[PDB]
Write a protein that binds this ligand. Structure first.
Ligand SMILES: CC(C)=CCC/C(C)=C/CSP(=O)(O)OP(=O)(O)O
Ligand SMILES: CC(C)=CCC/C(C)=C/CSP(=O)(O)OP(=O)(O)O
Ligand SMILES: C=C(C)CCOP(=O)(O)OP(=O)(O)O
Ligand SMILES: C=C(C)CCOP(=O)(O)OP(=O)(O)O
Ligand SMILES: [Ca+2]
Ligand SMILES: [Ca+2]
Ligand SMILES: [Ca+2]
Ligand SMILES: [Ca+2]
Ligand SMILES: [Ca+2]
Ligand SMILES: [Ca+2]
Lengths: 300, 290
């Protein structure tokens, strides 16, 4: 029981999030069906099953906002979910965060072994780029090439991998970071893929990305604050991964620096910032407004 | 002489391109590890890109993006292959491996970011004025590199290590096709793809070249000198691997590699003498000491 009903999320948001999760899973199923039945591929399927699909949902809903067909947008939605999944397979490794459970199930290296986890994460990164450049993703090659270039910049040693590297350099020193420092780290480690996801609908429509980029800056920070709160107050049965971890690793997080009350308040302010950033879209962006409430109020 | 000069110049060009691109990233250990992992090498795959581009009258200043891309992808694959959980190698290209010099996390992440960089490099607008070309280069790269291509090969290779019986010739050949054939095939087809030209002849060339290359790599593991090859030798027997030498013997493996030179060369007939550097590359892949 995730306690979702108790939160009274808007009907359209709930229906659309449920449909997006089923659509992403169906697309992974179809794409992976073409691959050989070997442990690495089974591990790819394991690692991509489940999840909230926030990032894939952002792609689908920003595409909807820009009148892009769902049948095209699914490619980019699945792509970002593949990229995200790869990052978690590697993060969970013994040499990194060393976690035994993810999404309520054993992690890849636990169910198989470390080599299988390394390779499944490697192939999932590759699959993200296959999915965004597949001709089904857009009738425009310029759009596909730009989606892939942007994804590489979000994902690599200026984006997500940079954030990871900085995080590890902190874990190892058990170092005390300022609020600015953990914010710069967050921007790479988690902000970059959420930014790519929210900008995707505009990129697919060859439209201005500025409003969705601003939206995503707020949303991503709210999301990370919420994640840091769940580590402190959350229930491992609901969250599907171990909690209480950050303290033991000597991690400065938004909660360790600000305290819970002020972290919650900051996340609440960021809902407003995120919603304000959508003003130019008017009512058509209402699902994306409710997404900002979800990212803070979710139990998992 | 002209072949050797072209190869030397290509190696310098690829190193210069890595030096430019990587200097734009922050000066952190992960980026230092990316530079470490991409330095050196024969640059066979990059050279294939540059020379098949030349063949198809593509500008060298465009082709360098794809040449550096395939070298980044290849470099990533070696950083992960060398890991303790994989082949557990302490030396590569005469230098410590990334996990030895740094640590396993840094190796995992550097390899990750090098894969990502490969896709950044092919999709950068410099790679081609045609977005159709860039999207095609990226899509084909992903299909060559992932779990239908290079990673498939790696998965098959690891499964072989605890197979009940040694692999047959057909089985190690299918393994080779994924593990080393795929990236070599991408590299050779790159010039045709850059020109939106027919890839069939270069795909055939590369099927032969890649198999000859692996047979040669298997021969070097058996007869080669670690000081010359830059990595440990005798590894295959230690792991109990079926290889082309274990299945054929050295004499017959050498003769097969020579037969595949002829096949590679015949594949280029439609190009005439404009393809001579590619013919010399096939002879190189079998002659080479490292
Ligand atoms: C493996 C690479 C390059 C980057 C990892 C990016 C990433 C999303 C890290 C996880 S943030 P973290 O707070 O550690 O996430 P949970 O395990 O708590 O779900
Ligand atoms: C890490 C992944 C997915 C693939 C590795 C692909 C690759 C080129 C492996 C090396 S084949 P191998 O004969 O083992 O190469 P050497 O170490 O002998 O140079
Ligand atoms: C970036 C972070 C904090 C990793 C977990 O992300 P999610 O909380 O979105 O995980 P899933 O829904 O994909 O399981
Ligand atoms: C695919 C294999 C057999 C890995 C080594 O390839 P190379 O022998 O081309 O290595 P470098 O020149 O890049 O060092
Ligand atoms: Ca973690
Ligand atoms: Ca961590
Ligand atoms: Ca966390
Ligand atoms: Ca090896
Ligand atoms: Ca091996
Ligand atoms: Ca070898």
């Amino acid at each position: 029981d995730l306690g979702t009903e108790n939160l009274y999320f808007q009907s359209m948001f709930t229906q659309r999030l449920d449909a997006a999760a089923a659509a992403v899973q169906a697309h992974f199923d179809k794409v992976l069906a073409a691959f050989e039945p070997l442990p690495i591929v089974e591990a790819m399927a394991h690692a991509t099953s489940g999840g909230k699909r926030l990032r894939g949902f952002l792609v689908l809903e920003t595409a909807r906002l820009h009148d892009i067909a769902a049948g095209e947008a699914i490619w980019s939605a699945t792509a970002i979910e593949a990229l995200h999944a790869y990052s978690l397979v590697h993060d969970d490794l013994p040499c990194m965060d060393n976690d035994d459970m993810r999404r309520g199930q054993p992690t890849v290296h636990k169910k198989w072994d470390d080599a299988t986890a390394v390779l499944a994460g490697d192939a999932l990164q590759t699959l993200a780029f296959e999915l965004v450049t597949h001709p089904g993703a857009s009738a425009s090659a310029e759009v596909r090439a730009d989606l892939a270039l942007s994804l590489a910049r979000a994902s690599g040693a200026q984006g997500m991998v940079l954030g990871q590297a900085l995080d590890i350099a902190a874990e190892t020193a058990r170092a005390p970071l300022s609020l600015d420092e953990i914010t710069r780290l967050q921007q790479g480690k988690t902000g970059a893929l959420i930014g790519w996801s929210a900008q995707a609908g505009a990129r697919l429509a060859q439209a201005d990305t500025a409003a969705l980029k601003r939206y995503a800056q707020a949303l991503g920070l709210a999301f990370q604050i919420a994640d840091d709160i769940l580590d402190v107050t959350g229930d491992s049965a609901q969250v599907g991964k171990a909690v209480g971890k950050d303290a033991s690793a000597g991690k400065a997080t938004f909660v360790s620096l600000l305290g819970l009350d002020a972290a919650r308040a900051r996340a609440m302010s960021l809902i407003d910032e995120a919603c304000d950033s959508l003003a130019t879209y008017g009512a058509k962006a209402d699902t994306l407004r409710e997404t900002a409430r979800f990212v803070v109020r979710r139990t998992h």
